[PDB]
Design a protein around this nucleic acid. Sequence first.
DNA 1: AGTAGCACGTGCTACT
DNA 2: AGTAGCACGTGCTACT
Lengths: 87, 87
Amino acid sequence: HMADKRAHHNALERKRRDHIKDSFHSLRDSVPSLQGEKASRAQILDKATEYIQYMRRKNHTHQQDIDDLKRQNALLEQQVRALEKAR
Amino acid sequence: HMADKRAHHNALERKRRDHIKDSFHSLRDSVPSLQGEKASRAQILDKATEYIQYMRRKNHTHQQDIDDLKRQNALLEQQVRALEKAR
DNA sequence: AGTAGCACGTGCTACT
DNA sequence: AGTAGCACGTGCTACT
């Protein structure tokens, strides 16, 4: 019957929607701005998006800084090895 | 009437849900894994969560590496300035 | 044939 | 008094 066909479809929908609620919970706890405080689904999506843009830019600049200091370490190590050839 | 009260509540719900659909679109485009390809809402929430854990760890190690090279640049710059005092 | 996924509707709580 | 937000239901498309 229809009441049997609906109850089965409704059951499969709740179990799938409980997995989504768990994912919002996990995502909300992944953003330090929303961690521990009850936030709406609109805020979780938007803040995580802003936080991903922040992490990508900050990780990009840090990678640039690592390359700078490595090149600077290379010129310094070579200048020590050269100055150590003198007396 | 009820049909008037429902239509107004349904209208406010669609406009709010269209903003959430826009946020999933923005979030999906923030993850390089899901960018450009049609992904479900369960995947957007889970992959962004995995990508945030990845960015936080990789940004933490890069910050650690910047501190190492800076301390190493400091000992190298000092060793050059000392060796430059000789002849 | 069965279902994942989503648009849309609905009624309630808890706010403003 | 009005509504944001959510749990839950419902019917369809598009897959397996």
